[PDB]
Amino acid sequence: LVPRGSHMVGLIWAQATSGVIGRGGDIPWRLPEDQAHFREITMGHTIVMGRRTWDSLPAKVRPLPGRRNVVLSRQADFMASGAEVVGSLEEALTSPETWVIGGGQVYALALPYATRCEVTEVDIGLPREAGDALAPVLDETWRGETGEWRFSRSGLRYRLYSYHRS
Ligand SMILES: NC(=O)c1ccc[n+]([C@@H]2O[C@H](COP(=O)([O-])OP(=O)(O)OC[C@H]3O[C@@H](n4cnc5c(N)ncnc54)[C@H](OP(=O)(O)O)[C@@H]3O)[C@@H](O)[C@H]2O)c1
Ligand SMILES: CCc1nc(N)nc(N)c1OCCCOc1ccccc1CCC(=O)O
């Protein structure tokens, strides 16, 4: 689907229905169903994340296994064992296909370059609070399909969106 001379940038995230994606250095829900989805989309690929998202990764999956982990930071001395640290968005997006995997800051920055968004919406009414990381806002140029609600094993509802643009 992607010619090898191109540079497809895609964003992938999970959000509460309020747009909250992050809080207290973590994701404020647990959803193995979403974890599986995230892996299906990103496995084998270059993935790009902000330094705080690197910090947020559970120790057991830092770096995220089976993927080329790229961490954006302005700290030259940052230690991200098993990953590479780059100081600019430009050096981060050199692969023919890249998945930007968080967090709020990096989604916001990368969106203008992006032509795919893979979104999980969790049916949880978490009000927005000072300091929360939020999902980026998609304008009218985006289009795609909204999947049906499904219950997770725990009875938490979720659904998937698959957006793209030209
Ligand atoms: N629900 C989801 O899908 C999802 C996914 C991922 C993360 N999260 C959550 O989101 C939160 C983190 O998001 P966040 O917005 O706070 O932080 P972030 O985007 O992960 O990372 C921010 C950092 O990235 C670096 N950075 C940003 N722009 C840069 C640029 N142009 N060049 C170089 N470096 C740059 C800076 O690091 P330095 O400060 O080191 O310079 C900055 O502090 C956490 O709560 C996490 O759990 C949620
Ligand atoms: C699974 C959370 C998640 N879900 C979606 N749809 N997009 C993300 N960018 C995302 O965040 C990716 C970074 C945080 O990753 C995790 C956070 C908690 C548990 C497991 C994982 C990823 C597990 C893995 O991919 O090996």
PDB file of C-alpha atoms in Angstrom, residues 48 70-74 85-94 109:
ATOM      1  CA  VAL A  48       8.117   7.320  17.602  1.00  0.00           C
ATOM      2  CA  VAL A  70      12.532   6.122  18.645  1.00  0.00           C
ATOM      3  CA  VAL A  71      12.377   8.592  21.529  1.00  0.00           C
ATOM      4  CA  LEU A  72      12.121  12.350  21.026  1.00  0.00           C
ATOM      5  CA  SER A  73      14.000  14.385  23.623  1.00  0.00           C
ATOM      6  CA  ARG A  74      16.034  17.574  23.841  1.00  0.00           C
ATOM      7  CA  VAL A  85      17.005   9.164  21.049  1.00  0.00           C
ATOM      8  CA  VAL A  86      16.565  11.873  18.446  1.00  0.00           C
ATOM      9  CA  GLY A  87      16.526  15.628  19.043  1.00  0.00           C
ATOM     10  CA  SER A  88      14.090  16.636  16.285  1.00  0.00           C
ATOM     11  CA  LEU A  89      10.872  15.511  14.590  1.00  0.00           C
ATOM     12  CA  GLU A  90      12.749  15.480  11.273  1.00  0.00           C
ATOM     13  CA  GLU A  91      15.241  12.778  12.223  1.00  0.00           C
ATOM     14  CA  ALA A  92      12.368  10.844  13.738  1.00  0.00           C
ATOM     15  CA  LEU A  93      10.322  10.467  10.544  1.00  0.00           C
ATOM     16  CA  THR A  94      12.786   8.954   8.083  1.00  0.00           C
ATOM     17  CA  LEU A 109       3.254  18.152  16.655  1.00  0.00           C
TER      18      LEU A 109
END
